[PDB]
Amino acid sequence: PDWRQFCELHAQAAAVDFAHKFCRFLRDNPAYDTPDAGASFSRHFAANFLDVFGEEVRRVLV
Amino acid sequence: PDWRQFCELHAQAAAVDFAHKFCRFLRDNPAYDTPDAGASFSRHFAANFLDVFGEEVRRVLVA
């Protein structure tokens, strides 16, 4: 089934939707609208995403 | 509005949703459920998400 494609397609849809919410957030809160905002979010994302993923997976059991 | 919480809540939302799809994918394709799966899938999703994120943000700002 191509597990990579699976990951990529769901990641694409999630990232696209978020990118819109992101731009919406920066327009409503211009104080956060800097050139490194995306980089900051990305750091929070990598960390939090992998941790929550691991906990949700082990929790889905039942 | 707290920046940390904004980022954390969206990151969490994304992880919870994909964890569900991941589990559902491994149920329909058990051959893929191995001790390496969790790390492989989550990391590949996370890398692609970030790449796509940057691209859509730019596309949206220019438009």
Please indicate the experimental technique that yielded this structure. X-ray
**Containing structural domain, residue A47:** 1-62
Give how far Cα B43 sits from Cα of A14, A21, A23, B18, B35, Å: 15, 23, 25, 12, 14
Report yes or no: B9 at the A interface, CB cutoff 8 Å. Answer: no
- What resolution, expressed in A, was reported for this entry? 1.7
| Amino acid (1-letter code) at residue B24 | R
Q: How many CA atoms lie within 13 A of A17 on its CB side?
A: 9
| Amino acid (1-letter code) at residue B59 | R
> Residue B22 maps to which CATH number?
6.10.140.110
- Distance CA(B42)–CA(B49), nearest Å, equals 10
Residues B19, A57: C-beta atoms closer than 8 Å: yes
Report yes or no: A34 at the B interface, CB cutoff 8 Å. Answer: no
∠A55-A32-B43 over CA atoms, to 5°? Answer: 30
Number of domains observed in the structure of chain A? 1
- Distance CA(A56)–CA(B16), nearest Å, equals 6
Shortest distance between the Cα of A37 and any Cα of chain B, in A, equals 10
Q: How many CA atoms lie within 13 A of A8 on its CB side?
A: 5
Chain A positions touching B44 (Cβ under 8 A) are 3-4, 7-8, 11
